Amino acid sequence: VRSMTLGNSTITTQNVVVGYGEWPSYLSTAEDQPTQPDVATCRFYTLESVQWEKTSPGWWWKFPEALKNMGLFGQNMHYHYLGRAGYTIHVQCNASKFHQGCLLVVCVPEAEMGCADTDTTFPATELTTEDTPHVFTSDSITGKKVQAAVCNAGMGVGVGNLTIFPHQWINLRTNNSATIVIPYINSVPMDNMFRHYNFTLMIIPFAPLNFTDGATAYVPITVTIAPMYAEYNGLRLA
Amino acid sequence: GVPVLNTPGSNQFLTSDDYQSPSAMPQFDETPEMHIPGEVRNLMEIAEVDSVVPVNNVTGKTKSMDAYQIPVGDKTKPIFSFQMDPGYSSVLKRTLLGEMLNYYAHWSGSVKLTFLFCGSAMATGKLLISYSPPGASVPTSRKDAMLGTHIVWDIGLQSSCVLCVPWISQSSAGYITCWYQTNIVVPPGAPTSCDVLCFASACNDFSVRLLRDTPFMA
Amino acid sequence: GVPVLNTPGSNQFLTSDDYQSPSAMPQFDETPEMHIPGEVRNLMEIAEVDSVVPVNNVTGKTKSMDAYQIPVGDKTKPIFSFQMDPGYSSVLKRTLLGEMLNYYAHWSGSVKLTFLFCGSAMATGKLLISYSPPGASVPTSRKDAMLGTHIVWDIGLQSSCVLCVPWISQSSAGYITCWYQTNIVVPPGAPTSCDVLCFASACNDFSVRLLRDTPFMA
Amino acid sequence: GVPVLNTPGSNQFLTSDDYQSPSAMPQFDETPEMHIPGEVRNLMEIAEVDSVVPVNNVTG
Amino acid sequence: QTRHVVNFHSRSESTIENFMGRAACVFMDQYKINGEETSTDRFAVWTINIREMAQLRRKCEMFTYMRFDIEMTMVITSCQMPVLTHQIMYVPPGGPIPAKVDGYEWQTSTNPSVFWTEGNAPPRISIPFISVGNAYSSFYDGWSHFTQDGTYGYTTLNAMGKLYIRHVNRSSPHQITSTIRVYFKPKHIKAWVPRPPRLCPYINKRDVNFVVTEITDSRTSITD
Amino acid sequence: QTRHVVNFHSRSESTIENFMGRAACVFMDQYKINGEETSTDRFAVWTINIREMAQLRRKCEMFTYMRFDIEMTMVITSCQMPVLTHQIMYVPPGGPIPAKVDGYEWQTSTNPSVFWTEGNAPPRISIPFISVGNAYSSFYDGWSHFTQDGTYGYTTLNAMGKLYIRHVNRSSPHQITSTIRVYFKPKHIKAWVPRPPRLCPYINKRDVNFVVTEITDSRTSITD
């Protein structure tokens, strides 16, 4: 049991999957100069806990803008139009000892998702609802929204071989916590934080939750994101 | 000047050549290469990643995520059984292993399998994972599987048993059957029926030769 | 003799090549190069020269030299305001900076601005030159411009204030507004209304990549 | 570039030549050579083997 | 066939340059020589992108980011005269395009073009890494216009240019219909961020939309 | 499009040789093969000057003085026979010119000429720095004839020669109309005395005359 703290946010934790073997880092010019906030930004932003029932198909969050209303990090998105960060993501499950199940906690950089009825697009409020997660579905759906059927998560790939990305299994038999560090994968050193979704944290239950008639009918999944090494553009003159 | 003579093969266009193409934009200086995380320098770095194998791909359970779940919890018939070849096998053909191997005609190597038991922390039982050599016939009973190659995998102690199946190549393969050694013993609070996930990758190193077009795309 | 074979791309005429052209006049010996003053060895030596920027390019003052004059001498609306990008901006597109940048598609660098106050030697006042970052909105008031980036430029002390605006590139830009901090205080002999000239060049060094044809010529 | 001039015999196909053929499968790496018993490196190694001679090859 | 001892140890054919760097025909098109002075059927266009045919498109979607020089060689035929000379004009991403076969854009000095006359070896034109960013992005989970406007998934970083092709002969007594086959080839290719293979069939050439497909082919029972 | 981080540091494309040294088509012309034994439509002329088309002319007027070798490559077509052979005769500034397709000037040993037959690679002829002075002058604020006579602005130092082009075939059964496209290219170029860019449109190809144009495009107010 390790009680990590960052700024004015302390969580209680219980091995880290460093995404692509790299730890996030700063970009290191007088023509373009970055600003490193360091202060705040790095604290833990615990999202709303998500109840995992027997019939839950999955969830996804789209970052960096899932934190668009989260404190100073969600406020520096409105004043600077360029930025980058690292996003240590803790995922606890705090189930009991009689609950069973298994989760895939994967990050999927550049998850370009497909519309539900092709030949058209979706109204841009179907990919993300800032803090709250869009759930997947168990079967196919229609309408101007994301094709959120599992087995074809968002991208038209098999959902089983989604393990190629930075992932972590949460088997309630053994463990309950996951932690992933995603060192800002992008093709340009800095990009706008409202246009571009750098990665898509999606939690997918492979083995479904099961229990008997006495336990609690759900297992709350707690998501915590710490934006590390966040740096922005400069606002001062040179 | 220099007396040259054109050989057969001059002024032709061989599709697979490596000649110096005259650059259309010589003045143009391309963008400097930054370090982007997660470089691939070889395709067989994708095959070495574990990925979930749809063992329960029966006729009505392939468009849901019930394809990946092996139901555990009749001791006379095996739990599951499938050909051990990532090509031309319905179970292992759309795996990351089995999908980077359909780009090639000649491949040879070994393949490791991980069986993650996704049941309760109180459920306890034994499963017997038998392997048949590529020429041998499948075991029809649990005893005949015990007399061959097997691993009596105690679930209550460890929850993940790893194999490494050799002699996997094409240019009549093995079998990974699984048997009830014991039933799943469970206290009054925990549920009775559990699931077992499977995984597959390249075990140590994988050899692969002749590139071709994939059959899946039409 | 030497067995050669022609690759694809033989006997073609690529427009952008750097081959050894056979000289038509080989006997001819060209005139010796004398030293002529003022050699250009790089185009960005033209962009580094200051030149007057037509800020007052309103609908009827562009064919006269009233385009270059910013009238100074209502404190609620700014004196002038313009996009800070030498391409696709009416104020900075025909500058020496903005004209050597329309020959190129990818350019990135900084740009310095000099505000020469061309009023009397007795006129005294303050002007507040605010800069908005490329994402931010313009200040609607003088106080909201004071809370951002600014320089309260006292005219009576110095008559030329120099900026250096970074993050200027294309492949939604900044703003240089100017405000009456104080009015122009003037003795009984000197005139009341003054002018402010502006300038623009490359601040330290300028980066520019992809050559194209200019849009101005038809 | 280099001033060359084609001799007589350019752009012809002599059947018996030993020129460098452009390989169609350059990426392809061929199978390693194992040792197989009984290599022939010269035809006259076949002529040096005794063999039975049909001396009594009369009409029937 | 029979199961043989496939004994060797090699992964030189599995590297990225030996997997992607293969020439494939990506653009057939017809273009006439005469008639209809204001027509769009006297030249070819082909905006250069990797999402041309699904066989190559599938390989570029193994990887999220990749950068590579391209070296295309056209194969131009003709049907129905003099000896014909063609022009394959590559315009960069920032470049004017012709509207007609006799536009002034064809004479632009910043648009490199090859003038291949018939009978010789095929024309080869090579284009470096043009993009503004540091790699071409196969996937772009983002919006071109800020504040979640239209045009999902299309970034302007992975723009490669266009390829305008015409006859340079002004006219002809009879009709000549030329056919061009552009052979695209990645070169000096690097690739980052691997990605699972495509499962569903492709719908359209500018989006990732798909129909929900089954994971694998079904079998009868779990034990057969 | 969107504003990206255009991060790099390079000015190799802004040097003079990487700015001026680009091949551009500067002369299209027709010339027949037969008929009208005394006619001016059986050969081409094109007195070589930088003031040919306004796109290139604008770049040469960035600089007052410049010196450079020129390396032009013609692209010759034909319409309507035998195999055709052409002749591209460059006469120096001091050189006799033909008056007819069958003049004796075509046989002058001091006029270098290429004999390109149809079907091969395009003919390339390179011309060194001919001028009498030490540089070509883009602008000449002076009078050719002393004591302020006629012909303002035309010096004889920036004379480059002419380019007479004909068929060498004496006749033909039918009519063949050849088209030539001269691709001018400065080479090994130096440039002195920079100069502000042209603002007004061009009027005529031998003078600097212009119509008074507005400085920039107008906007509504000084503050919008």
Author numbering:
A (entry chain B1): 2013 to 2026, 2030 to 2043, 2048 to 2257
B (entry chain C1), C (entry chain v2): 3001 to 3073, 3078 to 3175, 3187 to 3233
D (entry chain j2): 3001 to 3060
E (entry chain A1), F (entry chain t2): 1043 to 1122, 1132 to 1275
Copy the relevant paper text.
Viruses from the family Picornaviridae form non-enveloped icosahedral virions that are about 30 nm in diameter. The capsid proteins VP1, VP2, VP3, and VP4 originating from a single polyprotein form a protomer, the basic building block of the icosahedral capsid. The entire capsid consists of 60 such protomers, arranged in 12 pentamer units. Here we show that the exit of the RNA from the particles of echoviruses 18 and 30 requires capsid opening and results in a loss of up to three adjacent capsid protein pentamers.
Specifically, we performed cryo-EM of echovirus 18 virions exposed to pH 6.0 for 10 min, mimicking the acidic environment that the virus encounters in endosomes. Asymmetric reconstruction combined with 3D classification identified subpopulations of echovirus 18 particles that lacked up to three pentamers of capsid protein protomers. We call the particles lacking one or several pentamers open particles. The missing pentamers always formed a single compact opening through the capsid. Reconstructions of the open particles missing one, two, or three pentamers with imposed five-fold, two-fold, and three-fold symmetries, respectively, were determined to resolutions of 3.8, 4.1, and 3.7 Å, which allowed their molecular structures to be built. Except for the missing pentamers, the open particles are similar in structure to that of the activated echovirus 18 particle: increased diameter relative to the native virus, reduced inter-pentamer contacts, absence of VP4 subunits, and holes along icosahedral two-fold symmetry axes. The capsid proteins next to the missing pentamers are more mobile than the rest of the capsid, as indicated by the three times higher temperature factors than the remainder of the capsid. Residues 1–42 from the N termini of VP1 subunits, which were previously shown to interact with membranes and facilitate enterovirus genome delivery into the cytoplasm, are not resolved in the electron density map, indicating that their structures differ among particles. The N-termini of some of the VP1 subunits could reach out of the capsid through the openings formed by the missing pentamers. The openings formed by the removal of one or more pentamers are sufficiently large to allow release of the viral RNA, even if the genome contains double-stranded RNA segments.
